Design a protein around this ligand. Structure first.
Ligand SMILES: NCCCC[C@H](N)C(=O)OP(=O)(O)OC[C@H]1O[C@@H](n2cnc3c(N)ncnc32)[C@H](O)[C@@H]1O
Ligand SMILES: NCCCC[C@H](N)C(=O)OP(=O)(O)OC[C@H]1O[C@@H](n2cnc3c(N)ncnc32)[C@H](O)[C@@H]1O
Lengths: 529, 529
């Protein structure tokens, strides 16, 4: 002393192994191959809740789950809380009702909190009103060799929560309801597109030229081909090539990879849905977005207004998903709050200096390089996005920020594009697709200028794609939504790790490890005293 | 001369750009923003095929597609083959029926083969019996700037086919039927699991320890965390952790990455479906596989026997998907054809030497290292897999090949596992999952031995996973199927590139480039002469 930091836990593990070893020598198999579960406990509850007090069904069913509680009134009567599908069912181990008495005492002695057990017997409702099962037989299906945390645990410490999801799902079962919700969202999306003739496709994740958006790629290497490859930033280009190929409507709900910073709204690998629809424009896509999200909100309320939160309490607000969404222009709203209305060449030097000095006038300065696009981005970010709470379509961005968006049909130096903002966050991005190969090539020129300027987040010229769209590319509307963030919205959480099963965590130190473990037995030891 | 290799093509491109430029100066927009398509040509055909010869409907509809043919009987009568959704509709441009005569002559002169056009007019059926549309108005939606290949093209040369999928989909539209089929397969799978309470989840693609199967990973690096990461070999471990967490039934249809050789059955990035089902064994999973695939075959015939091919012709055979599938044992069939029946310690040296000499006796030798598992793999591969044509369950492999499969409940030195073989190919792999943490750890030991032996395709010990399963892991059945290969089977193709939209191709040389282009104008020039 005072070393040996994770003493009690090691001791407990060793002793548990010893226990299951003794149990195995006694003629009991701790890990049975097959146990037939005749009914799940939600089905159990749904079927036998009609039972009155002291009533016992003649039916014999078999359930199985994780023991979260083990209490006994005597040696002949034990009560177990068996959890399955995030639902609780009581097991009333009554010795007089158990067929094998020896097995009864051995099993009831051996059962440890955390053990996966199975039981076979009669459904009932006790005098206490607790729906239960009285087992004729029972067995341990998988012994727990460590100490399960109490419910709840780690609710504050996000680290230990998201480092050991397999424990968090057990001690914080409510969290499951998030992920379920997520899978609904996805499914909904699929349906909405599948019913419109869209073809769900799969485009390569490994590339040679990262394009489709503005970011920095993960770099890998293929051995046999002896060549560097890049994990995709966006599936945009390939999907467009599919549209050129003759498949009018395509979509992909896939994993995108971006080597950037990690926060409450950014995971290095995330999930988006991108679709492309021939002979459509961003108006049709606006309507489709309103319809999809509005329906998605109505199938959980079912009004198109959703109740929401707001430190960490329950204060209420409302998100208005009623069609139509509010529509504002990127340059017009920026002009309105500025007082001055921008010089006319937005690409020129004059306007660059002007943005540079309305920047200091509002304390919104950009990290190098300070190109027009980046300065405008920090401007729009620190000034108007902070007030975009209700579902809002931010439309008609300039071209120097939109290389893959088609020219606006009425407004000079603007593009046919919108970004959907909800709760100060970008959820969706959509274009009227640029199908002019000449302008596309010159736009890739115009990106090369930027990545010469120091920017390494600009889009490189893809020659194959250029060839494809040079072979005639239909007028098309394009759409991209962040599944993770929409999930965040609908699940009412302000941390993206709440809707990602295994988020990317910084590998904990030896100090953080030592610490954490030391805490674990600090409290174990305190419980022992 | 004789240089300037891609002369005519360059000239054609330049001239086409000049053409659309002149067209734009004449007051016509080559790339209109929005054209409203009132009806698709399959819907068109479905609705107006009832028309008799010389009959004209009073309805006015608007269609749009790609011009694949342009012929004319006179200057007042032109015939276009407009393709949409891999379907042909004739456009009869009759000048007397066109509203804007000037627009008629300008448009009919400007239209080039490959152009995306839109038309608005009356449906009809001509004297020739050809279902058509007589346009009142029309316009070019997107001009084609290169020469589209004739139908068909490249049917032999797989290279140019799979290098430019956007062209192949146009000139070989039948190929589309493959990918459609694929998306059905996937969907089917989803349904089959969704109806059984399975939760469709997403596990990380970026790892720190590659596990779940036996292969070699792609290596990448995260900047902010300053750490090497690995693209997943299999989602097995994480899904298992989800099962430990309390989610009894999970599945993921995702992208797996393996840095290996490329052939007719191997793409560096492929798609698999993995599910895990608590309180099940590999028997139940056998039945589920029979049911799923049998149903999948019955929903395209609808008998459970499928007609198949077999040099490159149409010779017929039959795949028997009727339940039950034929079941053979890994060691018993290997014994039957051997004559001798293996020594009893399969891990020992004696049996190693024995396999080493029944190997030369059948000319089946292994590349270094020649471990027991690899020798047995080359043995089983070159000897019995060559005769597994009909759907066959190859069951009960030894443990030295199955580190994540549970011990067999009756047979020593064997595991509860099967591999589904169809047409000499592994399509599915399934276990009764190992839930014994001690044996799991010792098995990871037993893999470390191999990767010390020279093998770098063995599985490394995952401590987090070990912790998870040490926290009690329910008896579980696991399943993994190759979507790409199943697609190959159902689409009747012997090349995996036929069911992957953008397969990984070796970046063509300067010589291969020069060649290909030179061929293109060799034939263009021959056509000009
Ligand atoms: N032709 C129109 C195409 C529009 C899609 C475009 N290729 C595109 O990728 O556009 P992005 O904007 O790059 O991504 C759009 C949405 O992705 C979400 N998102 C982006 N980065 C994310 C991250 N690190 N973590 C989680 N989610 C993230 C956002 O909700 C965004 O609305
Ligand atoms: N507990 C049971 C888990 C079984 C799945 C196991 N983790 C696993 O991955 O097992 P594998 O065998 O690694 O992959 C199984 C199927 O994947 C297909 N496949 C594997 N490699 C492929 C490739 N390079 N290209 C295309 N398809 C490929 C096969 O059809 C195989 O049946």
């Amino acid at each position: 002393h005072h070393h040996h930091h994770h003493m009690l836990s090691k001791q407990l593990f060793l002793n548990r192994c010893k226990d299951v070893e003794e149990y195995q020598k006694a003629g009991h198999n701790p890990w049975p191959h097959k146990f037939n579960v005749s009914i799940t406990v939600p089905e159990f509850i749904a079927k036998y809740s009609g039972l009155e007090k002291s009533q016992v069904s003649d039916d014999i069913v078999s359930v199985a789950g994780r023991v979260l509680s083990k209490r006994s009134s005597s040696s002949a009567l034990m009560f177990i809380d068996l959890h399955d599908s995030q639902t609780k069912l009581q097991i009333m181990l009554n010795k007089s009702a158990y067929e094998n008495k020896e097995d009864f005492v051995s099993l009831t002695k051996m059962i440890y909190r955390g053990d996966i057990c199975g039981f076979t017997g009669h459904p009932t409702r006790t005098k206490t009103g607790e729906l239960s099962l009285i087992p004729i037989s029972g067995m341990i299906l998988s012994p727990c060799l460590h100490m399960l945390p109490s419910m709840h645990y780690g609710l504050g410490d996000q680290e230990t929560r998201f480092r050991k999801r397999y424990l968090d799902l057990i001690v914080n079962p409510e969290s499951v309801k998030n992920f379920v919700l997520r899978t609904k969202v996805v499914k909904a999306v699929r349906k909405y597109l599948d019913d419109k003739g869209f073809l769900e496709v799969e485009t390569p994740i490994l590339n040679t030229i990262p394009g489709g958006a503005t970011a920095r790629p993960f770099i890998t290497h293929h051995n046999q081909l002896d060549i560097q490859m890049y994990m995709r930033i966006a599936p945009e280009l390939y999907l467009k090539e599919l549209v050129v190929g003759g498949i009018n409507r395509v979509y992909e709900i896939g994993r995108l990879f971006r080597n950037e910073g990690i926060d409450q709204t950014h995971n290095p690998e995330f999930t988006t849905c991108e679709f492309y629809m021939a002979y459509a424009d961003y108006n049709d896509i606006m309507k489709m977005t309103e319809e999809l999200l509005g329906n998605m909100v109505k199938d959980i309320t079912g009004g198109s207004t959703k109740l929401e939160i707001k430190f960490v309490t329950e204060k209420k607000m409302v998100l208005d998903f009623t069609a139509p969404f509010k529509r504002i222009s990127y340059v017009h709203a920026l002009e309105e709050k500025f007082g001055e209305k921008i010089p006319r060449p937005l690409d020129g030097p004059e306007a660059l200096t002007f943005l540079k000095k309305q920047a200091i006038r509002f304390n919104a300065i950009c990290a190098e390089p300070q190109t027009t696009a980046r300065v405008m981005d920090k401007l729009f970010g620190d000034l108007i996005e902070v007030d975009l709470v209700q579902p809002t379509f931010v439309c008609d961005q300039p071209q120097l920020m939109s290389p893959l968006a088609k020219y606006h049909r009425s407004e000079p130096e603007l593009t046919e594009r919108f970004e959907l903002f909800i709760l100060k966050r970008e959820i969706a991005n959509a274009y009227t697709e640029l199908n002019n190969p000449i302008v596309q090539r010159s736009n890739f020129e115009q990106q090369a200028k930027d990545k010469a300027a120091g920017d390494d987040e600009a889009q490189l010229v893809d020659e194959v794609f250029l060839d494809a769209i040079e072979h005639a590319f239909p007028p098309t509307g394009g759409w991209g939504l962040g599944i993770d963030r929409l999930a965040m919205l609908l699940a009412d959480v302000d941390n993206i790790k709440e809707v990602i099963l295994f988020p990317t965590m910084r590998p904990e130190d030896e100090l953080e490890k030592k610490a954490r473990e030391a805490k674990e037995d600090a409290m174990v030891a305190q419980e022992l005293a």
